[PDB]
């Protein structure tokens, strides 16, 4: 009939990966869905503006890496760049 397109199973899989004892109330799932959707809109919006400023038709890993470098704070940006480069490293083999 109708759809919502939530991240629910992925955020829950990540929870069991960091803390195997821990669980989610659906009210907290609502927080996480709102959060990850908003951060996606922030990064994709930053990357879109950044690509248009640079007159490109494309966003690539360097547009998004720079957009993340703008959006994120101190140590979380350092770790986010570390995981973003690790993922692209183990994907490209």
């Amino acid at each position: 009939r109708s759809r919502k397109e939530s991240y629910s199973i992925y955020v829950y899989k990540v929870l069991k990966q960091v803390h195997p004892d821990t669980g989610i109330s659906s009210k907290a799932m609502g927080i996480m869905n709102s959060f990850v959707n908003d951060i996606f809109e922030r990064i994709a919006g930053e990357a879109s503006r950044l690509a248009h400023y640079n007159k490109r038709s494309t966003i690539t890993s360097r547009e998004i890496q720079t957009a993340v470098r703008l959006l994120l704070p101190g140590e979380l940006a350092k770790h986010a760049v570390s995981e973003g480069t690790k993922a692209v490293t183990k994907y490209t083999s």
């Binding site: 990540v14 990966q17 890993s61 994120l72 979380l76 692209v88 994907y91």
Partner: protein, 111 residues
């Protein structure tokens, strides 16, 4: 002929848990640019997945310290407002039904 049965995901090839194909799907249908890189959604998924791992670990520590193991919006708010990095990332947002971090001013404390 026919396409591949049980063809491996971009996510599991990257070693990620987040839906890299959906990240590409949403970057393209979300109209952010007219063309989108193949490793762009890998990097983006890995960042969203990292932020998700960090915020949930701190929330699970907040739950453990609160004598609980089901996350509720309170544990996320406690994590986000204890950590300065999440706090300064998340200044323009309210965690619904998470309340506020408990704080008494030094002038209001005893004697």
């Amino acid at each position: 002929g026919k396409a591949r049965a049980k063809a491996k995901t971009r996510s599991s090839r990257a070693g990620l848990q987040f839906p890299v194909g959906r990240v590409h799907r949403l970057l393209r249908k979300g109209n952010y640019s007219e063309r989108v890189g193949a490793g762009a959604p890998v990097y983006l998924a890995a960042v969203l997945e990292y932020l998700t791992a960090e915020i949930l670990e701190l929330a699970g520590n907040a739950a453990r310290d609160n004598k609980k193991t089901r996350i509720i919006p309170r544990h996320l708010q406690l994590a986000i407002r204890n950590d300065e990095e999440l706090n300064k990332l998340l200044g323009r947002v309210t965690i619904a039904q998470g309340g506020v971090l408990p704080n008494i001013q030094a002038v209001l404390l005893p004697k």
